[PDB]
Design a protein around this ligand. Structure first.
Ligand SMILES: COc1ccc(N2C(=O)[C@@H](Cc3cccc(OCCc4nc(-c5ccccc5)oc4C)c3)[C@H]2C(=O)O)cc1
Length: 255
């Protein structure tokens, strides 16, 4: 009710600090304050050697899967630390994760993105937005909409404490399909959402409607992920050399 709100937020923020190697503050330091730039095929090959016979498109997106698999592993550890998450039924734990991970992945991805490109290889590399756009279809259509989301998400000027509470709220959506105990999850989300609002009002006193603007972003992420999943399916089925990591196969499966 105030001490309990500090306690909920503390545990979430700390689980974020603990579990995510890359975060907004670290990313903004590196994108400022120097990362190897990938802006063409020569620089790509240079980075691959330092940071297969397959197409350039195939290699880039093979490496992405390694990054996303690490993030899904990190988000899982973060979820287990959200107060209440671990007392959930087991079917609900994996359901919340299956549906929540990519929404949370793309919200957090924004921290490493600017209008010109994004960090790769733990912030040791920077891959250009224009190089990504120069890939042949459908590979050039993968990242562009995430840059588009990210430019608008980054304009909200969130920091890591905001983001941590946001991500916990994404993970605890009571409206995931197949959920068995929606009432307990919904009680979890309400506290997170309530402390997020209060945190946003004190942290950002000049952005009146930051709370609702950020909630609109959940709907945008949900849309961004449904579209990404469709595109992953399409590439998987049309583009032979596009294997999918076995952890990702099951996430995408019943989406
Ligand atoms: C079967 O077909 C496909 C097609 C596409 C994908 N995926 C995505 O797209 C990934 C989405 C994703 C998730 C997390 C980080 C990402 O971006 C991290 C930046 C980044 N790092 C590199 C990179 C370059 C050179 C060398 C090292 C890293 O490139 C990029 C764009 C991207 C992955 C996914 O859906 O999990 C999966 C299967």
């Amino acid at each position: 009710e105030t001490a309990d709100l500090k306690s909920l937020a503390k545990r979430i923020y700390e689980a974020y600090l603990k579990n995510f190697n890359m975060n907004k503050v670290k990313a903004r330091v590196i994108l400022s304050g120097p990362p190897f730039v990938i802006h063409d095929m020569e620089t790509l090959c240079m980075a691959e050697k330092t940071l297969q016979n397959k197409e350039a498109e195939v290699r880039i997106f093979h490496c992405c899967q390694c990054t996303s698999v690490e993030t899904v592993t990190e988000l899982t550890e973060f979820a287990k630390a959200i107060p209440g998450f671990a007392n959930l039924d087991l079917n609900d734990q994996v359901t919340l994760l299956k549906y929540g991970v990519y929404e949370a992945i793309f919200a957090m991805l924004s921290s490493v993105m600017n209008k010109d490109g994004m960090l790769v290889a733990y912030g040791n590399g920077f891959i250009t937005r224009e190089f990504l756009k120069s890939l042949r279809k459908p590979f050039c259509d993968i990242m562009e909409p995430k840059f588009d989301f990210a430019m608008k998400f980054n304009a909200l000027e969130l920091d890591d404490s905001d983001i941590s509470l946001f991500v916990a709220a994404i993970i605890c959506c009571g409206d995931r399909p197949g959920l068995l105990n929606v009432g307990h999850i919904e009680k979890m989300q309400e506290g997170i959402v309530h402390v997020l609002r209060l945190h946003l009002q004190s942290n950002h006193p000049d952005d009146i409607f930051l709370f609702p603007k950020l909630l609109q972003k959940m709907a945008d992420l949900r849309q961004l992920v449904t579209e990404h999943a469709q595109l992953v399916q399409i590439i998987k089925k049309t583009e032979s050399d596009a294997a999918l990591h076995p952890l990702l196969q099951e996430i995408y499966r019943d989406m």
